[PDB]
Structures are given as C-alpha cells and as structure tokens.
Design a binder for this molecule. Sequence first.
Ligand code: SAH
Ligand code: SAH
Lengths: 329, 329
Amino acid sequence: YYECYSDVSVHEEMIADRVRTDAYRLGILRNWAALRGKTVLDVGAGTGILSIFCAQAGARRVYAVEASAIWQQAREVVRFNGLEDRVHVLPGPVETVELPEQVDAIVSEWMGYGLLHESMLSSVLHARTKWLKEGGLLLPASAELFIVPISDQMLEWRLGFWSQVKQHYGVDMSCLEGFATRCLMGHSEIVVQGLSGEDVLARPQRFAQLELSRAGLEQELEAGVGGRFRCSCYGSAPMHGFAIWFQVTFPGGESEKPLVLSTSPFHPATHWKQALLYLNEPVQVEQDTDVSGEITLLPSRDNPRRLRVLLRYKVGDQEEKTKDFAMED
Amino acid sequence: YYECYSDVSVHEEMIADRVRTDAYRLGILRNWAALRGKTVLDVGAGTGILSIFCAQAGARRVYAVEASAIWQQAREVVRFNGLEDRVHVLPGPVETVELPEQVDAIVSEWMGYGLLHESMLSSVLHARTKWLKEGGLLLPASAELFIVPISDQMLEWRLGFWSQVKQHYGVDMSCLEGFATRCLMGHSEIVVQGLSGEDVLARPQRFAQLELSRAGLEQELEAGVGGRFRCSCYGSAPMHGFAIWFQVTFPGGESEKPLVLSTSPFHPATHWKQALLYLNEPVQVEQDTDVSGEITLLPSRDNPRRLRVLLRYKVGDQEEKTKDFAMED
Ligand SMILES: Nc1ncnc2c1ncn2[C@@H]1O[C@H](CSCC[C@H](N)C(=O)O)[C@@H](O)[C@H]1O
Ligand SMILES: Nc1ncnc2c1ncn2[C@@H]1O[C@H](CSCC[C@H](N)C(=O)O)[C@@H](O)[C@H]1O
C-alpha cells in the first residue's frame, strides 16, 4: 500500500505487453500433454495470470509464489475466477517458500532488460534444483542473445536538430553538433530504446545460448556470458554502435512447434525493447564492411544484479577498440 | 563533459519547445523601443539563444550569464553568429558574477514545473535588485497561477484496463480496479502530465499573481503563494482532482500588445505541461456542482527548492477535505 502505484505500473505494463503475455499463454497451452493433471510452480506469479493459464491448460495444482505484496491481488484474481481449488497463491520469496511437494513443471516471467539486468534468473535456477522433479518441464526452457551493428535513426534526428535551429529562429547552432554528438555518444551507459527494423545494418549474430536445464549454469553466468561475433554490413550508413536483444524458447510439446518470444526489432515491440551500446562517435560503414568483436555480459562490481557489458570491437579498416558499459540502476 | 548529455537534453528540450522559444522572441522584439541601444542581462543564458534575440531587437550590449558548463557552447554560438562585440558570455552564477555596469533590462527563462519547483526565480529577483536600473524592464514582467478541477482521461483508461483483461485472455481482473484506483490516486505526489482541454471540468480560476518588479516579493514567496478559489462544473463526470498551471506575461511596448506565454491545456503544449493533484479517489460531479477551496504553494521542509502544495477543497455536498502533495525530486 505504501507507494503501491509502482506495483500497479509493473503489472499493467507486463499484462499490456500482449506479445509477451500471449507468448507465455501459447507456450503453456502447447505443452498441454506435459501439464494435464500435473503440478506447476509459478516463480514470481504477480497478478497470477500465468498460473491461471496453466490451469486453463489442465494443470491439477499450480503454486503461485510471489514475494511482493501484489500476492494479495493475485489471490483475489484466482478466487474471482473460481480457481482457488487448483491454484494456490503462496506469499514470500521463492527461495524460502515451503511447498507440500516437488513439481512437474516451472513457469516464470524472469527476463530483465538486456536479458540479465535485475532478472529473476537465479531465483528460477534455485527453484529448479530445489523443487522441479528430475527431467521436469521449464517454460521457457532456453534463452538466446543477439548482437548487431545499428544506425539509430532517433539519435541521428537528435544530433541534426542543432543544424536546423537557424531555419525558424535565425540563430545558427550547427556549431553545437560536435558537442551534442560527443555528449550523447561518449557516455558509458546502456540505453534501453526501441529501434525500428531498418536501423539494423547487418544480419544479427547470436553470441550466447542459455540452456536452463543445465546444472551449474548459475556458476557459468557469474564468470560472464558472451562470445565472439562477425558480420558484414548491408550498405552505406553512419553506424552509431550495437543493439543487443534476446529471445526465449518454449518446448514444442505434442505438436512439436517450439514457441519463440523475441525482443528483436524485426518482431513486434515488447516492453523490453533493445539495449543499445553506443560508440564514442559515429563510424561510416559501406556495403560489405566487416564488423567483428567480442561481447561479455557481467555483474557490476557495485551491485551484481546490475548489468555490465564489456565490448571489444573492430569496424572495417579502423583499429580494434573497447568500451565498458553499465545499466543506470 | 563528465555526463554532459543532461546539458544537451535540457537545451534540446528548451529550444524544441517552440511555443516557449517564440514567446520570448516575440516578447523581446515587441519591446524594441525599450531595448534599442540599451543593455541587457540574460540570467541563465544556456545556449545563448535569448541573448541573441535581444541583439536582433537592437540591444547594444547583452550580458549572457550561465552557471553550467554549457556557457562554452553559448560562447561558441555567439561568435559563430558574429555577435561577440554585442553579446558577452559571462560564466558563473548570476549572484556572484561581476558586470561592468547596471542594465536597462533583464531577460530570463526561469520557470519550473508548477512554476516554482526548482525554479530560478530567486536568482532573477537577486539579479534585479543588484543589477537592473530603477524602473528597468523585466521580460517576462509577471506570472499568474491557475487551478481547475479535471477528469484525467489517461488515468481513466489506466484504471479501466483491468476490467478489459478478460476479453483477450479469459482471465477476469475487474477485481483489481479498486486496488489500482486507490494506488494510482492515493499517493501524495504531484504528477507532471499533459492534459487535453476536454479533461477540464470548469472555468479555470486564477489563485495567484506575481509582479516581478515588487520589492519584497522574495519574502512573500517564502510564506507561500496561493489563495481561495471557487468554480462550478460544466457537466456530469468523474472528477479525479485538480490541475494547476501558469502563464507569464511580457510588457506590451509601443504596440501595447502584451504577450502571454501560457502552459494551459487550452494553449499549445509546452515541456512544462500541467501539474496534477489527484484526490484519493474519484468523485462524481454534475452540471453546476460547486467546487471550492484553498491552495498554497510552499517550499518543502527537506529541500526548499522542491515544491510542496497544501490543498484544502470541497466538492459539492461532500465534506471539506485536505491533502498535502510534493514533487518527486
Ligand atoms: N525471489 C522471488 N520470489 C518470488 N517472487 C519474485 C522474486 N523476485 C521477483 N519476484 C516477483 O516476480 C514478478 C515478476 S513480473 C511477472 C508477473 C507475472 N508472473 C506475469 O507474467 O505477468 C514480480 O511480481 C516480482 O515481485
Ligand atoms: N544562478 C544561476 N546563474 C546562472 N545560470 C543559472 C543559474 N541557475 C540556473 N542557471 C542556468 O539557467 C539555464 C536555464 S534554461 C534557459 C536556457 C536559455 N536561456 C533558453 O531560454 O533556452 C540553465 O542553463 C542553467 O544552467
């Protein structure tokens, strides 16, 4: 109650993100054969919506675990839809909650900005080991990370602003373009922004793959997830940096059609958008200009739930360069 | 340079606010007779744009005073437009800067959200006493504050969201409307948001008037500016609270046409928008429902540059009520 408008905004945003909500729904319904008459743990159930989807798919019992005070509204929604015999809202953190039994499946909305910024992944991996039966079902089951060079159209418009002041005002401010450019690009902060698809300058490259079933994924993550990438640009453009984004994949079930929830700018927009990594200044690329490097996602020294990115990159004939970024948390 | 994208964003926003920028421009040009061959002090000159407008209007000398490091770009713009003989950029705070002389006029973009949140008014009043000649020109010369009851259409859409979840998802969340309503309205925070004109439920009432020429305005402000108001509603609606906004007025000059820069939702949008004061829950009003009360704007106990609002109000047959608000700074 004390400042509970944040809780309302989080879940309004989450439910209003139809692509996300429908991805989980269809992901769940497609695993009807694995879920029918079986038991499910919803890690961080929020308003309870995903737990109710599991009931819709035929789960006998769903344990909706929620740490925030939103759990009371989740309970109200469950009973308001007459599912209190099949869905049980359990308040508290998932790492300390007491279930009456192990489960056949886990469902969880755990992904953060850039996948791993302030995410619930460790809670999910903790709850897998503790509560999910051996060979059990994970929804989603995997995650993939992508990187690509971009020309951010919005930034270009912001930088070109100063050279147009003269038109209506008779004061020329073209001289500030360099200052503007160096300020909006020279910072070391990951910018969360929605790109349009035509801002993408090459075929997106996958640099990491997270199999959530693997034991000791938790340890590998602490060392940092990332890898090398290479691509070639489509045509002439001012490159301002890179975008990273993710997808998660739900198992196929009986129909054997795995469902992908993507946050790519080629797929419908989500609240996650994309995470943008700006170079210190623009770089002109050409058709077939080769762009390569290495990217690692890491926990920040200060707060390890905050996302840090080490980028090593090389654009065409330019020397190899590096830049450290972090999310503003 | 260290995190100078904030400086770029402030001034991009400020210049891109065409209504504001053109108001100052025309306000200045209309006082050509008072400014021609005379001297001007631009309090907080930023990119220098207003100082250059004063040159355009015929000022012999303009002293552009700027505390932030943006002063270097202001200097660059002045020389890039060939005005370094008439406009002199002086770095530092206006309260400690050293001018070679008193001035015939002051121009200043000083207004904050809700007029007085983190505003430069005291700097302006300080610089008036210290540097402006007796009887000198103030641009703008006055400010006025308005209040009106509103039905916030955006909030209504946010509150109605939960009752529509069922349509596409088959999970009914109408039960959360009360929780949503109490959370988004029960807080004590001034919300800065742009309203549409049809959200206004009555004739706006002016509750305060600031004559910037008056000595001891600085002392009166510390006691708090405000006053009583009374109005009657136009028709049936769910009232969610009040909006406050301001205008500033430039002297008329030879044409005797004073220019008003308004932040009302009946005039074109500005970056200031309006400051919204929400009731703890909606109240239904009717045609001719009488809404009255008292509003005071104050410095907050913690930070006095942060805006606090005491509201006392009465809607129709309902009892008299009170609510304290503050801007999230
Ligand atoms: N360790 C933990 N244990 C239980 N809940 C957690 C948690 N960490 C985060 N959460 C909760 O998990 C939710 C993430 S948002 C997901 C909400 C809902 N499942 C949906 O898909 O719409 C939040 O409500 C947050 O409070
Ligand atoms: N005490 C003070 N002395 C000098 N400048 C100040 C000040 N307080 C705030 N400022 C500056 O005043 C500016 C307000 S924004 C106005 C910018 C410009 N005059 C325009 O109209 O577009 C900012 O650049 C801020 O850095």
